DNA sequence: GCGTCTCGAATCTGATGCGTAACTTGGATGCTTCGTGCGT
């Protein structure tokens, strides 16, 4: 029930994707073992798996985040960060890299109580026959709490953390509408919606996550720093 | 109707004398007859 949260203080504050693609050619070098192990990789391809990525990555406010889901995924960021560090230590002798460790304890609960939480970025479309599926909001809703649902149980199989089975999880509102780009080659911007708030019934605790694709760090947010309503 | 980091470490971890003295130290008894009085 332990989610491995590393912090890299750059010093200059640093895109998601943008440090995923430098970290990757950093850890080209370093054994390929971890390298596959780290961006979720097939050993000898370099392919997606279908199973819940347990290490992902994230902003920080002067760096990049290491979150490392369930006990698997949080070992490999334990024995992981010495090595990505003397990597970061190594291409930038212009500043110096600093790492604390925070190891959190993950759970969720539920209570009568309807909690509100808010996510700041969210991540609704993958394909335009999907996008059909999106043409209204009338639909839309629906895939939305679908989602969140989806991500929670899917995380909390991964991690093996039973969750609450009487759980109704609703949407609230929106602020903001942002785009969401995978590669820096392609052209097509996914759905992108900021400000999302979002009801549920249960107490949730440590990081949880949701929307796509979850070997990037978008869709992200702590439920422990978060508070609740 | 919030949590991580922290969540010790290194000694020391006995030493010395005193660590018996004096007496007591066994005793006694395991025969039957003969003569002279003394109680039934």
């Known amino acids: 029930?332990?989610?491995?949260?590393?912090?890299?203080?750059?010093?200059?504050?640093?895109?998601?994707?943008?440090?995923?693609?430098?970290?990757?050619?950093?850890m080209d070098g370093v054994q390929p073992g971890l390298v596959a192990t780290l961006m979720n990789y097939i050993p000898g391809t370099s392919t997606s798996r279908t199973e819940f990525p347990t290490v992902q990555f994230g902003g920080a406010s002067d760096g990049f985040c290491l979150l490392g889901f369930g006990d698997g995924?949080?070992?490999?960021?334990?024995d992981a960060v010495p090595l990505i560090h003397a990597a970061l230590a190594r291409r930038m002798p212009d500043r110096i890299i600093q790492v604390e460790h925070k190891e959190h304890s993950l759970?969720?609960?539920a209570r009568p109580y309807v909690l509100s939480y808010t996510?700041?970025?969210?991540?609704?479309?993958?394909?335009?026959?999907?996008?059909?599926?999106?043409?209204?909001?009338?639909?839309?809703?629906?895939?939305?709490?679908?989602?969140?649902?989806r991500s929670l149980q899917r995380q909390?199989?991964?991690?093996?953390?039973?969750?609450?089975?009487n759980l109704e999880v609703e949407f609230k509102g929106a602020v903001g509408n942002f785009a969401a780009k995978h590669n820096p080659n392609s052209k097509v911007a996914y759905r992108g919606l900021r400000?999302?708030?979002?009801?549920?019934?249960?107490?949730?605790?440590?990081?949880?996550?949701?929307?796509?694709?979850?070997?990037?760090?978008?869709?992200?947010?702590?439920?422990?720093?978060?508070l609740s309503g």
């Open 1 to 26: 029930m332990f989610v491995t949260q590393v912090i890299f203080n750059m010093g200059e504050r640093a895109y998601p994707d943008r440090a995923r693609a430098m970290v990757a050619e950093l």
């Open 156 to 165: 909390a199989a991964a991690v093996g953390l039973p969750l609450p089975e």
């Open 73 to 78: 995924g949080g070992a490999i960021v334990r």
């Open 107 to 109: 759970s969720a609960e």
């Open 195 to 226: 400000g999302a708030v979002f009801d549920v019934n249960a107490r949730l605790g440590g990081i949880w996550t949701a929307g796509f694709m979850l070997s990037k760090g978008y869709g992200q947010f702590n439920a422990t720093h978060q």
């Open 119 to 149: 996510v700041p970025r969210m991540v609704v479309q993958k394909k335009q026959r999907h996008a059909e599926r999106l043409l209204h909001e009338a639909e839309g809703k629906a895939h939305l709490e679908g989602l969140f649902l």
